[PDB]
Amino acid sequence: VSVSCVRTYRPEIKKGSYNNIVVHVKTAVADNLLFYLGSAKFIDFLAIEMRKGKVSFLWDVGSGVGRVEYPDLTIDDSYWYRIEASRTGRNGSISVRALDGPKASMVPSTYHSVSPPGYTILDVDANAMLFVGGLTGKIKKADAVRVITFTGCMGETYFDNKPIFREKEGDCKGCSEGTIQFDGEGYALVSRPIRWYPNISTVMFKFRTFSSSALLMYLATRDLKDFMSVELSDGHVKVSYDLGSGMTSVVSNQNHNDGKWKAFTLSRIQKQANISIVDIDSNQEENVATSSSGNNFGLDLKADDKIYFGGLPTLRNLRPEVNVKKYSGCLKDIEISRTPYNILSSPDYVGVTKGCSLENVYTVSFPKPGFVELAAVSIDVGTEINLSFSTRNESGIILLGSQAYYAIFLNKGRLEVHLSSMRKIVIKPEPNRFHDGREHSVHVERTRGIFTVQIDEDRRHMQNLTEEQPIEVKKLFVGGAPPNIPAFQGCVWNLVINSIPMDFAQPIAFKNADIGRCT
Numbered sequence: 001v002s003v004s005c006v007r008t009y010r011p012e013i014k015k016g017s018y019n020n021i022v023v024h025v026k027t028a029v030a031d032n033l034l035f036y037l038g039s040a041k042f043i044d045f046l047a048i049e050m051r052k053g054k055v056s057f058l059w060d061v062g063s064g065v066g067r068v069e070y071p072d073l074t075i076d077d078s079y080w081y082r083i084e085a086s087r088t089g090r091n092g093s094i095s096v097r098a099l100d101g102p103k104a105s106m107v108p109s110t111y112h113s114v115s116p117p118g119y120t121i122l123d124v125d126a127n128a129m130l131f132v133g134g135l136t137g138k139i140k141k142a143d144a145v146r147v148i149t150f151t152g153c154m155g156e157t158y159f160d161n162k163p164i165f166r167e168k169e170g171d172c173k174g175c176s177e178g179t180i181q182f183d184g185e186g187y188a189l190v191s192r193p194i195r196w197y198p199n200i201s202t203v204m205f206k207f208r209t210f211s212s213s214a215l216l217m218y219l220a221t222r223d224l225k226d227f228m229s230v231e232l233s234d235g236h237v238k239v240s241y242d243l244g245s246g247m248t249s250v251v252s253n254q255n256h257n258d259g260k261w262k263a264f265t266l267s268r269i270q271k272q273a274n275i276s277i278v279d280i281d282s283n284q285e286e287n288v289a290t291s292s293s294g295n296n297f298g299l300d301l302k303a304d305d306k307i308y309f310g311g312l313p314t315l316r317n318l319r320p321e322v323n324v325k326k327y328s329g330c331l332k333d334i335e336i337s338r339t340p341y342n343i344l345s346s347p348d349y350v351g352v353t354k355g356c357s358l359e360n361v362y363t364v365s366f367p368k369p370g371f372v373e374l375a376a377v378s379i380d381v382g383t384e385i386n387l388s389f390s391t392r393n394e395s396g397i398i399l400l401g402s403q404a405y406y407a408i409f410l411n412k413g414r415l416e417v418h419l420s421s422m423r424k425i426v427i428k429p430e431p432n433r434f435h436d437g438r439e440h441s442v443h444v445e446r447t448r449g450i451f452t453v454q455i456d457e458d459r460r461h462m463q464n465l466t467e468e469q470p471i472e473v474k475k476l477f478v479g480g481a482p483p484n485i486p487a488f489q490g491c492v493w494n495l496v497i498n499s500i501p502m503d504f505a506q507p508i509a510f511k512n513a514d515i516g517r518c519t
């Protein structure tokens, strides 16, 4: 990038019969001198310029001027363009490619023209001069060139298939995948795209989750007559919509909450709709189609109606057939009505984190004081408990069941373990703390008349428990639980009780649980 100032260079011509010049330009001015090559001894010259917004390549190899203009485009709208011209004897070509903008999707063509018959070599003396974006008074421009200034910014210049200041006159100077993760406590909105066309819908976004019941997307009119939703149902992707004449809904044959990225695509044309789910790695694709009932053809979403993702806020009204359960999982490449959206650019979303981190369903982590409720499990004679944790908060409950109860918890550095129906063990760390942010594995085994605990293979403590009746509880928790000791903060994983691995795929409840990884 270079604004304002003229940049002169001394070219190196390899083939006198061939020329190739590449320039990147960006301006709002209709007339400019983009490239120029000439010398003091010869009239010969090369030049790339614009007239009324059109790029023209002109030259004179000693027998008269040759000019070829690119008609397909006009480049004075401030987008970046790649202008490439070349010469073969008296034959010149011009080609323009827009790097961005509404023209960037065009297919760059190539027009040719020729200079008068005769000479064919680009003559130049020793002190040749190649100017970029303007002209220096050290050389007299060819009459054919009418404007010698340049208002804008120039890009990488290539001359004779090689990159390119001998003299710098003037004061020179330079010039949305949106991957997100929801953890069951957020939502996000997107205003309706102006490109929204009522009788044709187009929805795309990639998702990756372990959730079986969630809301992925929902939109509706103020009256609820017309709406559309995309949710997870038992792991399957389910689509529902009503255009005002009657609702319909399809559920995929396969479930897609395997932790892998999936590509979702909906295409509705009036009452008909094609849903497509693709496992991005294996490239396998599923296809399910459905049709709304009646005569209405449009999803008449209005100017002020919002489109939500991952969850919803509290709404006065809400379509009765949709599962609004907050979504836990990642999202990205959201596109609606041909319009891309980046939730992170949104100003009113809640409980969303940039990126994606989903490792397994046996790991959980708490950012803020939170908890995860698991199905009750009682400790009987012969029972074991194995888990791993890593917090930096001396005081925090790690495990807990519900008179009777059991618990593994850090206490001002100490790691208590309680059993009752009340005996308990308390290990004081030595040579290293527990809430030291690094891995730590606990082991607890209640046998006859005794119970044991052992952290990261050290002194397996012991304690009496002359009872045989199994200590049963009503609820089981990881991280903490609803009600006086501080909250737990770090992550717990690979929880095993009575030989059964305890996953967090779908907890009975939770609050501020970043299930799936150790943040």
Ligand SMILES: *[C@@H]1O[C@H](CO)[C@@H](O)[C@H](O)[C@H]1NC(C)=O
Pocket (backbone or CB within 6 Å): 091, 092, 112, 113, 114
């Ligand atoms: C100039 O070159 C192009 C391609 O190399 C060719 O299509 C065109 O006919 C040439 N001009 C003429 C007529 O010599």
Ligand SMILES: *[C@@H]1O[C@H](CO)[C@@H](O)[C@H](O)[C@H]1NC(C)=O
Pocket (backbone or CB within 6 Å): 267, 268, 269, 272, 273, 274
């Ligand atoms: C659905 O897909 C079929 C091809 O599988 C196509 O012919 C039809 O036009 C599509 N209709 C839509 C986009 O609803």
Ligand SMILES: *[C@@H]1O[C@H](CO)[C@@H](O)[C@H](O)[C@H]1NC(C)=O
Pocket (backbone or CB within 6 Å): 198, 199, 295, 296, 297, 298
């Ligand atoms: C969209 O569908 C409606 C029926 O719901 C129809 O009356 C209307 O003409 C369609 N829009 C157009 C003009 O394509």
Ligand SMILES: *[C@@H]1O[C@H](CO)[C@@H](O)[C@H](O)[C@H]1NC(C)=O
Pocket (backbone or CB within 6 Å): 392, 393, 486, 487, 489
């Ligand atoms: C727990 O640790 C976090 C940092 O991991 C800290 O911000 C917070 O204040 C701590 N909470 C308590 C109860 O000390």
Ligand SMILES: [Ca+2]
Pocket (backbone or CB within 6 Å): 044, 061, 062, 119, 120, 121, 122, 123
């Ligand atoms: Ca010549």
Ligand SMILES: [Ca+2]
Pocket (backbone or CB within 6 Å): 225, 226, 243, 244, 296, 300
């Ligand atoms: Ca309607």
Ligand SMILES: [Ca+2]
Pocket (backbone or CB within 6 Å): 226, 243, 244, 296, 297, 298, 299, 300
């Ligand atoms: Ca309608």
